[PDB]
Amino acid sequence: ATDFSKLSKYVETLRVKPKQSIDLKKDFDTDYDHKMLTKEEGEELLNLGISKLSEIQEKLYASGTKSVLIVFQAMDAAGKDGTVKHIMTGLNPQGVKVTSFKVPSKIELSHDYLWRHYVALPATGEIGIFNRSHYENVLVTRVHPEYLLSEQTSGVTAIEQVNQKFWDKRFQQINNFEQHISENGTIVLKFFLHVSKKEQKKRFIERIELDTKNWKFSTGDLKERAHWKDYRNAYEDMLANTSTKQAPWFVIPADDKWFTRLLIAEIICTELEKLNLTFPTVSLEQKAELEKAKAELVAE
């Protein structure tokens, strides 16, 4: 009945189940038109979600036991960078690291495609946010197989060699990677921000018309949009083969940003709450030390 219980219920429908097939036009909304709360209420609940998340982070850091890896993927202008900024703003910098994986360096191209991601994994007690991730290697690379030609370790000397079997094998490799880290103390949560083609267009135009922001918009941004369908295919096949119970994907409607952020904060808090984190407790010995310390201070 409660608005929070409505949200909690709705959130469980966003998890990609391991056995399901994925049609992003039909099975998953870019916009939710049955919202259980107003924007204003959503904004106030998001702030609580960020505070709860900061509390969890501090308990995680003080514990130094599990690590947390949060992956974000999205089409351009879905609101991924803003979502990451908004979260980061409310967390302590000491225990939290954002890595944005760009075009690989020459050195990175001299290792397997997973190496730079493995290198950047979170240490125990830390939270690692991959803003773009290892998944780029079954997404941007799949839409533009020509990139595989610069990958010395990938074994591809001509794009005609690349077929469904090449992608199936990357999905297995990615799954093995995430299972391993999951079996060795890392909680893995993956978010695809799902924005409609129409809303992407409206965001592109809005930016182009802002004399304050339009220095940021290139011709290349259109080019990736012209591959909308190829990206959708790549995303579908990936979500259908790399969401496990242990490392789930969540598809988040991205067309209303406040709602996107709310949902992501909720899911992260919900999932991390299963860890039952608590702050350190003060033992009798420690209590005696405190009382002694305070006595000495007062005695000065």
Ligand X SMILES: O=P(O)(O)C(Nc1cc(Cl)cc(Cl)c1)P(=O)(O)O
CB of 203 to ligand X, least distance (A): 4
Residues 76-95 close enough to bind ligand X by CB under 6 A: 76-82
d(CA 187, CA 267) in angstroms, rounded, equals: 13
- The residue whose two tokens read 């998340």 is 53
CB of 8 to ligand X, least distance (A): 26
For ligand X, the closer CB: 35 or 80: 80
Site string for ligand X, 258-297 (x = CB under 6 A): ----------------------------------------
140 binds ligand X (CB under 6 A): no
For ligand X, the closer CB: 52 or 80: 80
d(CA 233, CA 228) in angstroms, rounded, equals: 9
- Helix/strand/coil (H/E/C) assignment for every residue in the chain: CCHHHHHHHHHHCCECCCCCCCCCCCCCCCCCCCCCCCHHHHHHHHHHHHHHHHHHHHHHHHHCCCEEEEEEEECCCCCHHHHHHHHHHCCCCCCEEEEECCCCCHHHHCCCCCHHHHHCCCCCCCEEEEECCHHHHHCHHHHCHHHHHCCCCCCCCCHHHCCHHHHHHHHHHHHHHHHHHHHCCEEEEEEEEECCHHHHHHHHHHHHCCCCCHHHCCHHHHHHHCCHHHHHHHHHHHHHHHCCCCCCEEEEECCCHHHHHHHHHHHHHHHHHCCCCCCCCCCHHHHHHHHHHHHHHHHC
CB of 257 to ligand X, least distance (A): 9
CB of 202 to ligand X, least distance (A): 9
- Residue count of the chain: 300
CB of 151 to ligand X, least distance (A): 25
Residues 58-77 close enough to bind ligand X by CB under 6 A: 76-77
Pair of tokens at residue 250: 């969540």
For ligand X, the closer CB: 112 or 224: 224
Kindly state the number of chain residues that form the binding site for ligand X, as judged by CB under 6 A: 14
For ligand X, the closer CB: 68 or 77: 77
Site string for ligand X, 186-205 (x = CB under 6 A): -----------------xx-
Angle subtended at Cα 18 by Cα 167 and Cα 250, rounded to the nearest 5 degrees: 90
For ligand X, the closer CB: 50 or 193: 193
221 binds ligand X (CB under 6 A): yes
99 binds ligand X (CB under 6 A): no
49 binds ligand X (CB under 6 A): no
CB of 85 to ligand X, least distance (A): 8
CB of 255 to ligand X, least distance (A): 12
Binding residue for ligand X, selected from 6, 15, 197, 207, defined by CB under 6 A:
207
CB of 87 to ligand X, least distance (A): 12
225 binds ligand X (CB under 6 A): no
Residue ranges that bind ligand X, judged by CB under 6 A: 76-82, 203-204, 206-207, 216-217, 221
